């Protein structure tokens, strides 16, 4: 019993608003053709450096600080990939049938065939980013999700198994459904009915299992490119995908 | 604007009860011990033959007929996985620390290491077996959720891009919606407040989530015992499997 469990829904968003990290830029050569190794470059390379922000905003949520220290590392390291896509498909928002990587990586899904098995997921990022489009999603309900993520994705499949164990677990739900209070709030906030508020929650929800699954396939994409000496060696980066040890 | 669309909460719900498929058995051998193929066996077989049924269940399922074949086809094969596993975990609710695949075979972690990389995956559907029962799980949510992932789980990645295909991605959704509408309705049938129907309807869906990331997982084993010469041939099995066409 902390912090979060008491903000009123609004601070819980503001927090949350303010808590977000900065847009980044990518060094970008327009110069020269990306090849499925050019590409992947700036794109393992945006995903790094977004990374070390990630961290920082990690810290920023409510009641992650009041876990265990390993269990944030664990959280963090079970959700990544769907942070960054999530944050990605809200960058391209606007923008239909492009993926604003960042302000200046502008991507199609033709690019999207220079590197390979690429083009898949790709697509399954754009009609992401579309789903919310044509929900009209809400920065203050990204926000929600965005920190929903961290919050689910790995909390079930934990690093204990003891007393302290079912009390994170028991921590991490009751921040969630806080959260849902608030979105649910947000929603009342625009004019919702009670029908639609529930709706609602459902669709945003139900799209998290898409990234959970676009997520994992992802990571799967990513190793291979690896197994391909095509990844440039990110410290950070390498960090993450290794914490799936997956094959 | 068919069957579904109107059906009343509990009609939606019987239906859906009604609807439900046989609880197979298993020619389990306890004669003989398990090996990194025996069990692998009975429980491939034992998936192969449920698959049979999951696709007459789909069909009973309300609007999943009004889609288009080929796009039932995409759904059912896209979520099936998952479907296995949502019915595992509901059938090991009861048991903890067991996952009563059938009434006859009945494994704990243990066996799960009898064959290699099965183990993680085991604890996953263990913890989601838990958290269910944690949560007083409902047998009239379970058959929510169960369709629920048929129509989620591969809507946003269907097989179309058209007309014909924004038409399908609107119907599903509808359906969804109503399928929302009965479950916030099966928890005001047992009196919760507003705000626990909300927390509890998220409560669920992002377990879904983790459901999306365990058939995940599953698949990637599965297609490794398959790269291993120990998966039996199963004609409908690897037509599942194959429909994702993963690495
Ligand atoms: C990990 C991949 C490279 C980095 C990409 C990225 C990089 C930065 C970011 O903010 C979002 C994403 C989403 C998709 C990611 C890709 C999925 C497949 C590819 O291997
Ligand atoms: C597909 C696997 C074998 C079949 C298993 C099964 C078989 C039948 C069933 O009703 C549920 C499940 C859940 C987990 C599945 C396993 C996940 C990994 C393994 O390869």
């Known amino acids: 019993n902390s912090l979060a469990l008491s903000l009123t829904a609004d601070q819980m968003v503001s927090a949350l608003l303010d808590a977000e990290p ?53 959280l963090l390291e079970c959700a990544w990939l769907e942070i960054l896509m999530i944050g990605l498909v ?7 049938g492009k993926l604003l990587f960042a302000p200046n990586l502008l991507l ?6 220079c590197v390979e098995g690429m083009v898949e997921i790709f697509d399954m990022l754009l009609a ?5 489009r044509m929900m009209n999603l809400q920065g203050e309900e990204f926000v929600c999700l965005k920190s929903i993520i961290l919050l689910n994705s790995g909390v079930y499949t934990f690093l204990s198994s003891t007393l302290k164990s079912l009390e994170e677990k028991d921590h991490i739900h009751r921040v969630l459904d806080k959260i ?44 291979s490119m690896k197994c391909k000496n095509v990844v440039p060696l990110y410290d950070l980066l390498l960090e993450m995908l290794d914490a799936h040890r997956l094959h």
């Open 180 to 223: 849902t209070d608030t979105l649910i709030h947000l929603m009342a906030k625009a004019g919702l009915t009670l029908q639609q508020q529930h709706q609602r929650l459902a669709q945003l929800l139900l799209i998290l299992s898409h990234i959970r699954h676009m997520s994992n396939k992802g990571m799967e994409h990513l190793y």
């Open 108 to 113: 199609d899904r033709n690019q999207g065939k």
């Open 90 to 96: 809200w960058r391209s928002m606007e923008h239909p």
């Open 128 to 132: 992401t980013s579309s789903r919310f």
């Open 22 to 74: 900065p847009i980044l830029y990518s060094e970008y050569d327009p110069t020269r053709p990306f090849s499925e190794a050019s590409m992947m470059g700036l794109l393992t390379n945006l995903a790094d450096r977004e990374l070390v922000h990630m961290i920082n905003w990690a810290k920023r949520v409510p009641g992650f600080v009041d876990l265990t220290l390993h269990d944030q590392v664990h």
